[PDB]
Design a protein around this ligand. Sequence first.
Ligand code: ZN
Ligand code: ZN
Lengths: 197, 196
Amino acid sequence: SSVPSQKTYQGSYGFRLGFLHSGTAKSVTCTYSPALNKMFCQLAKTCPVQLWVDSTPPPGTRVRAMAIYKQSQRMTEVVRRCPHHERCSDSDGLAPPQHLIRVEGNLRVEYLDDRNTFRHSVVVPYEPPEVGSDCTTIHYNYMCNSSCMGGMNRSPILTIITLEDSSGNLLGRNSFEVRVCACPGRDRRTEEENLRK
Amino acid sequence: SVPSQKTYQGSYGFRLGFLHSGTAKSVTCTYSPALNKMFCQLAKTCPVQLWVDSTPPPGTRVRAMAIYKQSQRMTEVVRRCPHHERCSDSDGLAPPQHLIRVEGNLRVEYLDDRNTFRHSVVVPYEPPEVGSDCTTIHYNYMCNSSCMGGMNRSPILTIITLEDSSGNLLGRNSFEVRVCACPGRDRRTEEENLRK
DNA sequence: CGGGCATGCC
DNA sequence: GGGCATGCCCG
Ligand SMILES: [Zn+2]
Ligand SMILES: [Zn+2]
């Protein structure tokens, strides 16, 4: 019916994202390309995303992740797990089986299947960093490959990360492209080389 | 539990023939005598010829069923993967879960077995048309051998049985099937892997 | 159909 | 990491 905004918005708290530096060994479970602003990862493997802010949002602030198709031809379509993976019983105990994006390690995670847009998202309460740290790290998992037939079917996606108050009002927004694939190092390297040809 | 795959020509001298289609990369259906194996593309016509020495009785039928070839999966029902089951490729006769359809036969019947839950497709036996010495059935395979959540790279066999009207066996033959994007490429590859 | 390549897997 | 199996796009 409509399309979510993907416009970078630092907001009043100076909200931005950070990623580890991981390298490009042919596989490697998760690697991020600064050149492409694109995460490359394997199915069900830890994808760390760092949340950086300048002030600190109030308690009750939430951090939401949602996938959308990058291409305008599919952008109104909801990003979901393919029929196979939806039915494969790899439940972590909380994530519903149709959801592409999961959060690891957080008892307070909530999954939303919006009644009106039909879009899936996963949301955790915002927490300040630990002592000795400058950022909050969320561990995401992507539960289908970009290639899965009947699901993403090779269509590229964006993950939109939004900072929101308790009622769902926008406080900040950032995004990154993601490719979920068998060989993240190889594929990251390939796409970076295509940028130099 | 596993249906028999024992070849028997039975009293009517029942056996199968296949077109001799060669190995151009993407030939739609091609059969390897050395491998007794059909290689074919998803949803493309796969002609299977029925040859008999004498005409079986009125009411005879011809059934096709797929089974897994490897012992570790032989007990599992062969079915289409979750994706293909749900794609919009119905012919309005075949159940969406069934791997094997018959095209061009309004008298086709499909069965899910009471006890084994295996799928099959059955058509009336018809004698060859005038000028012909065999009867051709046009099968279609509706999932690739490689499909995740289904065959998932496990080899299958198709078992063709000739049956009387009550289902009693008159004859049986079988062939391996690989459903794939490039049947010629893949046949030539397999036949080359036979050699030292 | 199919050269050329994308993308699974070990 | 290499490679090889095996699928898809658009001419
Ligand atoms: Zn999937
Ligand atoms: Zn399939």
